[PDB]
């Protein structure tokens, strides 16, 4: 899995250990081994959500499988929770795009997962 | 809908009010209320387009529906127009990837839009 | 085609000429003219791969066609190669997401490619 968060929250407001928390919780939620989880946080962005520059986030979670209606609701509760607790972003100012990747369309270690 | 622009134009060249202009015009084009539109501009990027580093943009518009042949031509005219007028980027140095998201694949407010 | 590299390697560690090299190598690999290749490198990122902040990269290659099982294995060998040689990133800490874009879903020069 690969989880990306882009936010207008400043870098100083991202707490120490946040990338590890995300890694841990995503491994648990997706069922994937932690060695396969990648996470990427991009603060200080020039963004608006509903026309407003109050704290917001635009995110993406891509995974080979483990994407679907019920799973994605679960991930959204988890991730909006983390963004609210840690970054002080309202859940209603977060979008998370989910992507179910075919294994042939993910490169890693000089090959793909197919 | 969510619109992201990555560009090598410097931050100071992004005019005041541009995120609101994008929000407004995207609301009109997609038909969706502006409260649902998110916009994200990433200046100062290390980029090339066709092997050269004059002003360029790599963008994305992801929406639950409102994506298709005709609509995407319209959006391209609109958005290339804005990028040329406001950021002085030639339309021929802009790519916009369009993504029609399934509602169950967009997280928001602790759940999905399904 | 458009190739994006997000990495925690510092800006200074990206060699002069790297965007041109990627352009050339991608034009050869995809068979598309260089004028159609766009490349984007984002250093200095806050990222982790398998919980580790050792050098890593999260990448994307989107193209109208020229994507599939065998082609993507080849691209992965190529691009992991380049990232290892030039940025000193282990192939096993690189993900590359491949996107086969429909021509009607790529905007350019006030219209789409359809």
Curated annotation (Swiss-Prot), chains A, B, C:
N6-succinyllysine carried by residues: 77
Location (main, coarse): secreted
Superkingdom field: Eukaryota
E.C. numbers: 5.3.2.1, 5.3.3.12
InterPro entries: Macrophage_inhib_fac, Macrophage_inhib_fac_CS, Tautomerase/MIF_sf
Region forming the signal peptide: none
Keyword annotations from UniProtKB, A to Z: Acetylation, Cytokine, Cytoplasm, Immunity, Inflammatory response, Innate immunity, Isomerase, Secreted
Active-site annotation: 1 (proton acceptor)
A Gene Ontology biological process term: carboxylic acid metabolic process
Cystine pairs: none
UniProt-annotated location(s): Secreted; Cytoplasm
Induction of expression: Up-regulated in concanavalin-A-treated lymphocytes. Up-regulated in macrophages upon exposure to M.tuberculosis antigens.
Gene Ontology CC, one term: extracellular space
Catalytic activity as recorded in UniProt: 3-phenylpyruvate = enol-phenylpyruvate; L-dopachrome = 5,6-dihydroxyindole-2-carboxylate
Gene Ontology MF, one: dopachrome isomerase activity
Chain sites annotated for binding substrate: 32, 64, 97
A UniProt-annotated Pfam family: MIF
Additional free-text comment from the UniProt record: Serum levels of MIF are elevated in patients with severe sepsis or septic shock. High levels of MIF are correlated with low survival. Drugs that inhibit tautomerase activity protect against death due to sepsis.
Similarity comment: Belongs to the MIF family.
Function field: Pro-inflammatory cytokine involved in the innate immune response to bacterial pathogens. The expression of MIF at sites of inflammation suggests a role as mediator in regulating the function of macrophages in host defense. Counteracts the anti-inflammatory activity of glucocorticoids. Has phenylpyruvate tautomerase and dopachrome tautomerase activity (in vitro), but the physiological substrate is not known. It is not clear whether the tautomerase activity has any physiological relevance, and whether it is important for cytokine activity.
Disease connection: Rheumatoid arthritis systemic juvenile: An inflammatory articular disorder with systemic onset beginning before the age of 16. It represents a subgroup of juvenile arthritis associated with severe extraarticular features and occasionally fatal complications. During active phases of the disorder, patients display a typical daily spiking fever, an evanescent macular rash, lymphadenopathy, hepatosplenomegaly, serositis, myalgia and arthritis.
Subunit structure, as described in the record: Homotrimer. Interacts with CXCR2 extracellular domain. Interacts with the CD74 extracellular domain, USO1, COPS5 and BNIPL.
Name by which UniProt lists this protein: Macrophage migration inhibitory factor
Protein species of origin: Homo sapiens (Human)
